[PDB]
Design a protein around this ligand. Structure first.
Ligand code: CA
Lengths: 477, 92, 10
C-alpha cells in the first residue's frame, strides 16, 4: 500500500518538517485538497504571462502533495507557501521567477521564520540573471531545490538547474533507472546533484478534494528532495547549504543506476545517487564530495577551476581529459581559500578539474609544492591529497611525481583524524581501489603508462588510461 | 564593460522585455533614477517605454518593456552591469 | 511534449 517512491527513499535502518517552511514556485494550487489543506498558505503572489480551472492547478497541487501531503507526502508535517509564477498552461517567465525569488527574500526580511527551502519545479534555458539571483538567495542562507529538467540533456544548459549553490535533482523510476521517454527524460551531467523518484508518483489531484493522480517529472523528483530537506533541517536546523548537500549525498543509495542509459561522456560526470531519508543511526563523521569543474575549453592556456563551498576544505585535486592531452593539476590559493586548477595541454580539446571538497572543522590545511627534480614532497600533520602538473609537452605522508613534474601535497592539521594510503595496480582501461566501509576517500591519483586521469566516485578512486596504479587516501576520525 | 545576453533556445526568447542588472552596490534610489533616465533618453528618440518592476533585495536593477533598438543606449547608462532579454520557463 | 511539461507530455 505504501507508494513505491516513499519506500525507495526509506533508508535500510529507520525510525516532519514543521520548524521549516517550504516555498513552492509553480502553477496555482487547490489549497483545500485534503492532502494539504491547512498546511499550505496560498500567498496569491502572482506573476504570469497571458495564455496563447481544474487544469490550472494540477501541476502545483500534485507537487504540494508530494512534499507535505498527509497520505502520500515525504514531509507529512511541513508548512508550505505557494507563489504563482506559472500560468494555466504551465508557462512562466524568467522575469516573473526573479520577482518571485525577490518576494521570498522580502517576506523573510519583514517576518523572519526558520530555515527556508524553496522548490523551483521549472526550467528554461541558461539564464545569467536567474542563476545569479538563485546564488544570491543561497548566500543569504536559503536552501533551493530545483528540477534538473526533462529534455534528456545536460542540466548545465538550463536554469535554475545550472545555478551555483542550488541542489539540482534528476528523476529515476521504480527500477532505479533514469527516466527516459523518447526524446524526453531526465537531464543529467555534472550539474545534477542527485536523483530521486520521478516516475509514476501518486499525489493530490486537483480534480476533486480527495482524488489522487500519478505524475512524472524532474519536478516530482525535486519535490522528494525538498521534503527530505525539510526533515533534515528540522532535525538539525543549523545546517549550512554545504552540510545539507554533503548529507543528502552521504545518505543516498549509491551505484544503483545503470549508467548505460546516459550518453558516454556524461557517465563519469553524472552522480550515481538516489536520494534517501537519513537513518535512525544518526557523533561526528568526515563527509567529502567530488566536484567536477566546467570543461576548460580548448585554449592552450585554458584552465578549469573546481571550487568548494566557503565552509568546506579542498583536500585533494585531480584532473581528466578524454584524449589524455593534459598538463595535470595544482592546488593554488585564491581569496584565502584553496581551489583546484587543471591545465590543458597544447592541442588538447580541454580538461576537467576534479576537486575533493570535505567538511572538516578544526582543520588547518596548507599546500606543499616542489618543482621538478623522481620529484617528491612530504608533510613534515596528515597527507590528504597528491596533485601534479608539468609544463613539458610529453614525458608515508609523501607524494611522488614524474621527474619532469611539479608535485603538490595537501597537508592537514586535523587532530582526531587518521589517514591511510591504499594502492592497487594491474596490466587495462581502468583501475579501481576503494576505501573500507567507515573510511572516507579524500584523495585519488595515479602512480607515475599514459593516464587520461583519476577521479573519486563516492569512496572509490578510479584511474583511466589508454603498469598503472591507483592510489587512494582514506581518512576517518 | 556592460554586456547583453539572450536565451540560446530561440523559441523560448521573449523580445521586447529586458532585465537591466546594475552593478552590485547600486542603491534602490539609483536604480529608479537609471530607469527614468532610460525612459527620458528613449522618449527624446521617439520610443515609448514602460518600467514594469524595480528590483532590490537580491539583484539591483529593473525590468523594462521597450524596443531592442534602445539596447546600445541602455548598455551605456551609468551603473549597468548587463542586460538580459526575458525568456520562457516551463513546469517540469 | 513542448516542452517536457505535464508528465513528459505523455
Ligand atoms: Ca549544482
Amino acid at each position: 500500500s505504501i507508494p513505491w517512491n516513499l519506500e525507495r527513499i526509506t533508508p535500510p535502518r529507520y525510525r516532519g518538517g514543521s520548524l521549516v517552511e517550504v516555498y513552492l514556485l509553480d502553477t496555482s494550487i487547490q489549497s483545500d485538497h485534503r492532502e494539504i489543506e491547512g498546511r499550505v498558505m496560498v500567498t496569491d503572489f502572482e506573476n504570469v504571462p497571458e495564455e496563447d480551472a481544474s487544469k490550472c492547478d494540477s501541476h502545483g497541487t500534485h507537487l504540494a502533495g508530494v512534499v507535505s501531503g498527509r497520505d502520500a507526502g515525504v514531509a507529512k508535517g511541513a508548512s508550505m507557501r505557494s507563489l504563482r509564477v506559472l500560468n494555466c498552461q504551465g508557462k512562466g517567465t524568467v522575469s516573473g521567477t526573479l520577482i518571485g525569488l525577490e518576494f521570498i527574500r522580502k517576506s523573510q526580511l519583514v517576518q523572519p521564520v526558520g530555515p527556508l527551502v524553496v522548490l523551483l519545479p521549472l526550467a528554461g534555458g541558461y539564464s545569467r540573471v536567474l542563476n545569479a539571483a538563485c546564488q544570491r538567495l543561497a548566500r543569504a542562507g536559503v536552501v533551493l531545490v530545483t528540477a534538473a529538467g526533462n529534455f534528456r540533456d545536460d542540466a548545465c544548459l538550463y536554469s535554475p538547474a545550472s545555478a551555483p549553490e542550488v541542489i539540482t535533482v534528476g528523476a529515476t523510476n521504480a527500477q532505479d533507472q533514469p527516466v527516459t521517454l523518447g526524446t524526453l527524460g531526465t537531464n543529467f551531467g555534472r550539474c545534477v546533484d542527485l536523483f530521486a523518484p520521478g516516475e509514476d508518483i501518486i499525489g493530490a489531484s486537483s480534480d476533486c478534494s480527495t482524488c489522487f493522480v500519478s505524475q512524472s517529472g524532474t519536478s516530482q523528483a525535486a519535490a522528494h528532495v525538498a521534503g527530505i530537506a525539510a526533515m533534515m533541517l528540522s532535525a538539525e536546523p543549523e545546517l549550512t547549504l554545504a552540510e545539507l548537500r554533503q548529507r543528502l549525498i552521504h545518505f543516498s543509495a549509491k551505484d544503483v543506476i545503470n549508467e548505460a542509459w546516459f550518453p558516454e561522456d556524461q557517465r563519469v560526470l553524472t552522480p550515481n545517487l538516489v536520494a534517501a531519508l537519513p537513518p535512525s543511526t544518526h557523533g561526528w563523521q568526515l563527509f567529502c564530495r567530488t566536484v567536477w569543474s566546467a570543461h576548460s575549453g580548448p585554449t592552450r592556456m585554458a584552465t578549469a577551476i573546481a571550487r568548494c563551498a566557503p565552509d568546506e576544505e579542498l583536500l585533494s585535486c585531480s584532473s581528466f581529459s578524454r584524449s589524455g592531452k593534459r598538463r595535470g593539476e595544482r592546488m593554488e590559493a585564491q581569496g584565502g581559500k584553496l581551489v583546484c586548477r587543471a591545465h590543458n595541454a597544447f592541442g588538447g580539446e580541454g580538461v576537467y578539474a576534479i576537486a575533493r571538497c570535505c567538511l572538516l572543522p578544526q582543520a588547518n590545511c596548507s599546500v606543499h609544492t616542489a618543482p621538478p627534480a623522481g620529484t617528491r614532497v612530504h608533510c613534515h600533520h596528515v597527507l590528504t591529497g597528491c596533485s601534479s602538473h608539468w609544463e613539458v609537452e610529453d614525458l608515508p605522508n609523501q607524494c611522488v611525481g614524474h621527474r619532469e613534474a611539479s608535485i603538490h601535497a595537501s597537508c592537514c592539521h586535523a587532530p582526531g583524524l587518521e589517514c591511510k594510503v591504499k594502492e592497487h595496480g594491474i596490466p587495462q582501461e581502468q583501475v579501481t581501489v576503494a576505501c573500507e566501509e567507515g573510511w572516507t576517500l579524500t584523495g585519488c591519483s595515479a602512480l607515475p603508462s599514459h593516464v587520461l586521469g583519476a577521479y573519486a566516485v563516492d569512496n572509490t578512486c578510479v584511474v583511466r588510461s589508454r603498469a598503472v596504479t591507483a592510489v587512494a587516501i582514506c581518512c576517518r576520525s | 564593460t556592460a554586456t547583453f545576453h539572450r536565451c540560446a533556445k530561440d523559441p523560448w526568447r521573449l523580445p521586447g522585455t529586458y532585465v537591466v542588472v546594475l552593478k552590485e552596490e547600486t542603491h534602490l534610489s539609483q536604480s529608479e533614477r537609471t530607469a527614468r533616465r532610460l525612459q527620458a533618453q528613449a522618449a527624446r528618440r521617439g520610443y515609448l517605454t514602460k518600467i514594469l518592476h524595480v528590483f532590490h533585495g537580491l539583484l539591483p536593477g529593473f525590468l523594462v518593456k521597450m524596443s531592442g533598438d534602445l539596447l546600445e543606449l541602455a548598455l551605456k547608462l551609468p551603473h549597468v552591469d548587463y542586460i538580459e532579454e526575458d525568456s520562457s520557463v516551463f513546469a517540469q | 511534449x513542448a516542452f517536457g511539461x505535464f508528465s513528459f507530455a505523455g
